[PDB]
């Protein structure tokens, strides 16, 4: 087993460990960052395999979270029109519709104010106006194989969660671990175009 991954932004290691439910013939088939949450200057981010959907067929659910920070100068949010960029890893197939597109039915985007996207539309929140997700979108390109979430505005104890499912491609090499994602990042602030923060990356393999 690889013991670590490396955050590209700051070039420090994170530990990775066995995912519960991934044991098969005395070996484990999946690894998660430990811890899977990372404290960044703007708040907290996280990424993990959060469930095993079908171990033999190498299908897993993936979960990302982000939460922000309130600053007084005027209140301001540390995450302000922020963007998540989440490329699928090499040999990782995102689970898509019958139509071959990433549709509302293939992901969830929810927030801790009780808002969520429903068929692409933000609903709920304490004002029933879409709340924390009023301006959020989930985008996918089938060629680049990359999810983006735009429109994040988050202060203290304001948190958003994304889930989706993936499957290891049949062309896997035996015993090789594959990162579930390419470099996965949060750009917290539209006003700071060069500030980027890495999410840690889970890994999977088959025999
Ligand atoms: Ni629904």
Author numbering: 145 to 217, 588 to 721
Excerpt from the publication:
RrgA is the structural pilin positioned at the tip of S. pneumoniae pilus-1 and contains four unusual elongated domains.
The amide bond formation between the Lys and the Asn side chains is dependent on Asp6008. This pH dependency suggests that a residue, likely Asp600, with a pKa value between 5 and 6 might need to be deprotonated to participate in the reaction mechanism. The structure of the complex is indistinguishable from that of the RrgA D2 domain (rms of 0.61 Å), indicating that the fold adopted by the Jo and In partners produced individually, although possibly different from that acquired in the context of the full RrgA sequence, still remains compatible with the complex formation.
